[PDB]
Design a protein around this ligand. Structure first.
Ligand SMILES: CC(=O)Nc1nnc(S(N)(=O)=O)s1
Ligand SMILES: CC(=O)Nc1nnc(S(N)(=O)=O)s1
Ligand SMILES: CC(=O)Nc1nnc(S(N)(=O)=O)s1
Ligand SMILES: [Zn+2]
Length: 257
């Protein structure tokens, strides 16, 4: 029964998930001046041309756009990664206000939201096995700032009315996640964790430097979602972000100067 409220939010999670206090937790603050340029980091290879979206689900914590990950259709390779990582889902974290919502921060700056494209290492066969491995997942994180609309986001925005409450899903086929990416694939990378329980330390984080712009109306629609199920008192789905965790014995690497 974890969540984002005063009595079950991030400061409480450690009681049920003691790895919350572990050595490689996420998110973190990205101190841009202390990140180390690593010229041997390769360009990211984002291969989403054959991506097959299936469904969108309100899980009571966020909404997930799910993909067919039973073949190498949408994969992430390159960068800091060895091998092939299949896209399973994407989701966002966002705030009640435009000045908060991201999980990662950049020189302590918070963005209005953060997109997470979640991928798992095919050598482990399935996501459940991958999350038990230190190199099991690769999450591509993209910041959202409020300004001009993101045309490639609007099909997601438009369906949210149909998944207002926890447990609701809708068909969501033929969505092209390439429409969510910024122009540049410059990134920061570090070893971390899932940012929600069970907080497993299985993630290679790849956080893009360049934010995408979304409109105020687009993020306002995110904020009309509900944490609660249908027929329960309304709890707006806002502030579903974990704050930055201690970096501990990690160095953030940059792909760019
Ligand atoms: C009633 C209640 O608080 N149940 C909880 N279950 N897990 C929680 S936690 N520590 O993961 O936030 S709180
Ligand atoms: C199925 C799945 O992807 N679960 C996740 N839990 N937390 C995640 S995050 N915020 O670290 O990307 S992904
Ligand atoms: C075009 C471009 O790169 N814009 C940026 N805005 N902020 C940046 S950040 N995350 O490095 O602070 S990069
Ligand atoms: Zn996330």
């Amino acid at each position: 029964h974890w969540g984002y409220g005063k009595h079950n939010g991030p400061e409480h999670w450690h009681k049920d998930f003691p790895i919350a206090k572990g050595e490689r937790q996420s998110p973190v603050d990205i101190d841009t001046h202390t990140a180390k340029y690593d010229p041997s980091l390769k360009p990211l290879s984002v291969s989403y041309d054959q991506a097959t979206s299936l469904r969108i689900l309100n899980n009571g914590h966020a909404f997930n756009v799910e993909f067919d990950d039973s073949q190498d259709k949408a994969v992430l390779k390159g960068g800091p990664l060895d091998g092939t990582y299949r896209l399973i889902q994407f989701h966002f974290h966002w705030g009640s206000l435009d000045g908060q919502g991201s999980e990662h921060t950049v020189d302590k700056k918070k963005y209005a939201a953060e997109l997470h494209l979640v991928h798992w290492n095919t050598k482990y066969g399935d996501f459940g096995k991958a999350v038990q491995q230190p190199d099991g997942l690769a999450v591509l994180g993209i910041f959202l700032k409020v300004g001009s609309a993101k045309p490639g986001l609007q099909k997601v925005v438009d369906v949210l009315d149909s998944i207002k409450t926890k447990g609701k899903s809708a068909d969501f086929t033929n969505f092209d996640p390439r429409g969510l990416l910024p122009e540049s694939l410059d990134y920061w990378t570090y070893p971390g964790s899932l940012t929600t329980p069970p907080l497993l330390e299985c993630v290679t984080w790849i956080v893009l430097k360049e934010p995408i712009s979304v409109s105020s109306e687009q993020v306002l629609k995110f904020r009309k979602l509900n944490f609660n199920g249908e027929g329960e008192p309304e709890e707006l789905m806002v502030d579903n972000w974990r704050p930055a965790q201690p970096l501990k014995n990690r160095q953030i690497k940059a792909s760019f100067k």
